[PDB]
Swiss-Prot record:
Species assigned in the record: Homo sapiens
Lineage start: Eukaryota, Metazoa, Chordata, Craniata, Vertebrata
Cofactors, names only: Fe(2+)
Domain of life the protein comes from: Eukaryota
UniProt GO molecular function: iron ion binding; tryptophan 5-monooxygenase activity
Disulfide bond sites: none
Catalytic reaction(s) noted: (6R)-L-erythro-5,6,7,8-tetrahydrobiopterin + L-tryptophan + O2 = 5-hydroxy-L-tryptophan + (4aS,6R)-4a-hydroxy-L-erythro-5,6,7,8-tetrahydrobiopterin
Role played: Oxidizes L-tryptophan to 5-hydroxy-l-tryptophan in the rate-determining step of serotonin biosynthesis.
Alphabetical UniProt keywords: Iron, Metal-binding, Monooxygenase, Oxidoreductase, Phosphoprotein, Serotonin biosynthesis, Ubl conjugation
Protein name, UniProt field: Tryptophan 5-hydroxylase 1
Cellular component annotations (GO), alphabetically ordered: cytosol; neuron projection
Chain residues that bind Fe cation: 153, 158, 198
Pathway this chain belongs to: Aromatic compound metabolism; serotonin biosynthesis; serotonin from L-tryptophan: step 1/2
Length: 274
């Protein structure tokens, strides 16, 4: 039959909840997400000195790389976020501020999330231009890479591209295609999402650039992706969807899209086939 799926933005309420000082702090963030209901302003957080320091390292080092590494669309939106959302080395932007910024730019909004959602639930949010974002910060011991998404990843990796109309359309269309889809169809869409939105490369003016959020938030993998000691293949949904998504490590392959326009067109033809 058809699995349950959200029919309106508020329906995401029904799925978005599915050392030791660090553990209590993570519990603090998890509770903020769990207690959140659509319509609420997203709770603003007073980040600790250690948290801000970790952000600062990530922010400072990544901004050295972006001009030569990030796609043009990313670079176009990054300064607007400094101006309007408080993106500075000494300040961690608030999810509420960035959500409101996105709402005016592309209709995207943010919802705080306690941890990992199922691909089905995560993608369902995108259908309504809702991006589920973590609020906690990377453990201070490794600013260069983290196996789990943190707020640094959401804010530096995802947000600047969600502010771009062509990318927001591409993202929503993955979400829309997933709604009520088979288990097999969701996995293929989630893999395409992973190798574009999370870890994608694109060719711009003949050169390789990165648009993958998971690359754009990792000092170490961003350098690795374009080094180039990594394997790169063309983005092709029927091939890309079979690729294993790696966690805990750098990816073993990166897929190259021609443009956000082209990636969207390839996804449109592919979703008809499944
Ligand atoms: N969208 C997505 N998926 C990830 O993992 C996938 C994943 C998919 C589904 C689940 C899942 C969770 C809960 C229930 C369920 F059924 C499935 C968990 C992880 C998979 F394992 F497939 F690769 C991992 C990430 C990710 C993880 C970490 C980072 C941080 C980055 N490396 C950095 O250092 O900034 C950026 C992105 N993003
Ligand atoms: Fe992500």
């Amino acid at each position: 039959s058809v699995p349950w799926f959200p029919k309106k933005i508020s329906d995401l309420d029904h799925c978005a909840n599915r050392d030791n000082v660090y553990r209590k702090r993570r519990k603090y963030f998890a509770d903020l997400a769990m207690n959140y209901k659509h319509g609420d302003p997203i709770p603003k957080v007073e980040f600790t000195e250690e948290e801000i320091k970790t952000w600062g390292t990530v922010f400072r080092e990544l901004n050295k790389l972006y001009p030569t590494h990030a796609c043009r669309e990313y670079l176009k939106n990054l300064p607007l976020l400094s101006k309007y959302c408080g993106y500075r080395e000494d300040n961690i932007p608030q999810l509420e501020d960035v959500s409101n910024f996105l709402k005016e730019r592309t209709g995207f909004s943010i919802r705080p999330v306690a941890g990992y959602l199922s691909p089905r639930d995560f993608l369902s949010g995108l259908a309504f231009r809702v991006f589920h974002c973590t609020q906690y910060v990377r453990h201070s011991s490794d600013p260069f890479y983290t196996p789990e998404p943190d707020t640094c990843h959401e804010l530096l990796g995802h947000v600047p591209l969600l502010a771009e109309p062509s990318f927001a359309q591409f993202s929503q269309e993955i979400g829309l295609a997933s709604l009520g889809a088979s288990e097999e169809a969701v996995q293929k869409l989630a893999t395409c999402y992973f190798f574009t939105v999370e870890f994608g490369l694109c060719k711009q003016d003949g050169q390789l650039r990165v648009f993958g959020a998971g690359l754009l938030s990792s000092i170490s993998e961003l350098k690795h992706a374009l080094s180039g000691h990594a394997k790169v293949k063309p983005f092709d949904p029927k091939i890309t969807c079979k690729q294993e998504c790696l966690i805990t490590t750098f990816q073993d392959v990166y897929f190259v899209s021609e443009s956000f326009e082209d990636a969207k067109e390839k996804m449109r033809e592919f979703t008809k086939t499944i």
